[PDB]
Design a protein around this ligand. Structure first.
Ligand SMILES: CCOP(=O)(O)OC[C@H]1O[C@@H](n2cnc3c(N)ncnc32)[C@H](O)[C@@H]1O
Length: 559
């Protein structure tokens, strides 16, 4: 109330400093968490791509905007801001010549190549709502998101390299799009010939030549939807988490600068795929809005070997490195010897996102990777918060391995006890947020009631996480207290694993849970009510083909 005026005025001041406005706003904050009618910067006009491209020209026109490294180490690309601006303007005009209009949903099924950032930004320039589907998702998983989003246009690619092997991405898109009325825009990511159906599918490198390189950015309302991310929950199939335009970009860009403090001459490398929220906020939108060079890597941390990340960090002089504890633990399982070939002297800051980091992995990250010279910002947040919420600062003394420390400014977390009351001082319980914040997800696509029932309780936002808070006010995130899983860094739901199992003809009922696993964090344990080991393999095969390899059950227990 009075607190809300303080938060309103704080965020209003951040919005006017952080991003360019086509038109200023008239009401900073409106609505709240009791009703779930939160509105930020109502009356304002802006465009996300203008903040990430146009406004950096021409002073940073020749600064590298995106460094790209291929799974094959000999494959490298850079795009300056001027180059990236023209690529986005062209793909905007290509989408409009394909009938994509403001407020249409556009599907994106791309690997970590520059065209993934261009596709997102091009949707943002024209007011389309992109829905990025993780390119490691199977055809069935892609297909279910295309039906749920009702998108008429899908941006995808022929193939890409992961580890040694080629991933047939276009075949999976075709399988997913069979009985749907989808126009495909296809990026040629191979030197190998590919044959398209000319009626409904188009080559990007051809259509780019049919359109102008200038495209006026849409003047977007702050509450226009920017994108949908299909996200696993504790009940049911993944739901479409809707983020809007104004508050999302304000807090994504502000927290990127507040936590990582990159200067115009530095290289920032977050390893998250664009298919997850971390890829949205801290690979594409946050860094490019701040005018900071961001790095996109196509492959995996262990190919050709467990030294790959540091060879990339030395090759491009990465200064800030932001990755997941699953990757940290697997590289330290590989052995400290893989740290001996590199220098890593360009690094000044390490980051951790996506799951708790245990002290053994924090110390290995700090002493060995960072050589003792880098703070570790352990950032807690979620898809539904849109941006970092609780995090150490680089400026802070380096202490408490495994603690996310204090909320960022303008954010009020709290703990609730088993009877629903707010815990004062030191304790533990349910992690919640007390007041609205600019980058909060605004609804579930189609079912705002399911959004309110799932996230809003007695005027608070319910994270679904447990936490401790010590005598200093520092937070310690213990993990999901609901049924949501964290498996090798991926947020997963039991419902999609259960239905993928039961759709097998021999399976009648299934029950999936998570058990502790040292390398994966959680391993997927499935109870299956059908009887051999041959069937365990085909039932693990069923889950990989329905969802992804990441969701494959690690133990199948027949009941
Ligand atoms: C940005 C990823 O967003 P999501 O994929 O939506 O996962 C969100 C869920 O990951 C977990 N989590 C994320 N960061 C941390 C962290 N620093 N320490 C501990 N746990 C963390 C937590 O359970 C949260 O609710």
């Amino acid at each position: 109330t009075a607190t809300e005026e303080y938060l309103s005025e704080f965020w209003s001041e951040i919005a006017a400093q952080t991003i360019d406005w086509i038109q200023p706003w008239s009401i900073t904050l409106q609505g709240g968490l009791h009703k779930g009618d939160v509105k930020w910067f109502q009356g304002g006009l802006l465009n996300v791509s203008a903040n990430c491209l146009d406004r950096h020209l021409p002073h940073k026109a020749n600064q590298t905007a995106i460094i790209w490294e291929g799974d094959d180490e000999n494959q490298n690309k850079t795009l300056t801001f001027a180059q990236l601006y023209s690529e986005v303007c062209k793909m905007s005009n290509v989408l409009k010549s394909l009938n994509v209009r403001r407020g249409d949903t556009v599907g994106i099924y791309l690997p970590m190549i520059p065209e993934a950032a261009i596709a997102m930004l091009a949707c943002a320039r024209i007011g389309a709502i992109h829905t990025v589907v993780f390119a490691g998702f199977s055809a069935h998983a892609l297909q279910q998101r295309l039906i749920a989003s009702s998108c008429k246009c899908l941006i995808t690619a022929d193939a890409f390299q992961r580890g040694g092997k080629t991933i047939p991405l276009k075949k999976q898109a075709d399988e997913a799009s069979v009985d749907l009325n989808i126009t495909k825009l296809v990026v040629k990511n191979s030197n190998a010939p590919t044959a398209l159906n000319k009626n409904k599918e188009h080559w990007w490198h051809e259509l780019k030549q049919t359109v102008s390189d200038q495209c006026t950015p849409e003047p977007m309302n702050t509450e226009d939807p920017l994108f949908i991310l299909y996200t696993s929950g504790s009940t049911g199939q993944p739901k479409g988490v809707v983020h809007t335009t104004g508050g999302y970009l304000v807090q994504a860009a502000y927290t990127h600068q507040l936590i990582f403090a990159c200067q115009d001459n530095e290289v920032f490398w977050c390893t998250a795929d664009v298919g997850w929220i971390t890829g949205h906020s801290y690979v594409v939108y946050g860094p490019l809005c701040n005018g900071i060079t961001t790095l996109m890597f196509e492959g995996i941390p262990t190919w050709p070997d467990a030294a790959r990340n540091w060879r990339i960090i030395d090759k491009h002089q990465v200064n800030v490195f932001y990755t997941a504890p699953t990757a940290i633990r697997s590289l330290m399982r590989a052995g400290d010897q893989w740290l001996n070939s590199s220098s890593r002297s360009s690094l000044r800051l390490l980051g951790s996102v996506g799951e708790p980091i245990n002290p053994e992995a924090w110390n290995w990250y700090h002493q060995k990777v960072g050589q003792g010279k880098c703070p570790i910002v352990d950032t807690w947040w979620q898809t539904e918060t849109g941006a970092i919420m609780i995090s150490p600062r680089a400026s802070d003394e380096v202490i408490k391995p495994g603690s996310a420390r204090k909320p960022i400014p303008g954010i009020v977390p709290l703990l609730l006890n088993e009877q629903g009351h707010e815990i004062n001082g030191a304790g533990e319980g349910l992690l919640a947020i007390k007041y609205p914040w600019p980058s909060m997800a605004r609804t579930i696509a189609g079912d705002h009631q399911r959004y309110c029932n799932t996230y809003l309780s007695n005027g608070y936002y319910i994270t679904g996480d447990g936490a401790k808070r010590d005598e200093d006010g520092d937070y310690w995130i213990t993990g999901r207290i609901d049924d949501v899983l964290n498996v090798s860094g991926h947020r997963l739901g039991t419902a999609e694993i259960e239905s993928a199992l039961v759709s097998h003809p021999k399976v009648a009922e299934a029950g999936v849970v998570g058990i502790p696993h040292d390398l994966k964090g959680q391993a997927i344990f499935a109870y299956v009510i059908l009887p051999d080991a041959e069937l365990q393999t085909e039932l693990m095969e069923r889950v990989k083909d329905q969802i992804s390899a990441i969701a494959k059950p690690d133990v199948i227990q027949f009941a």
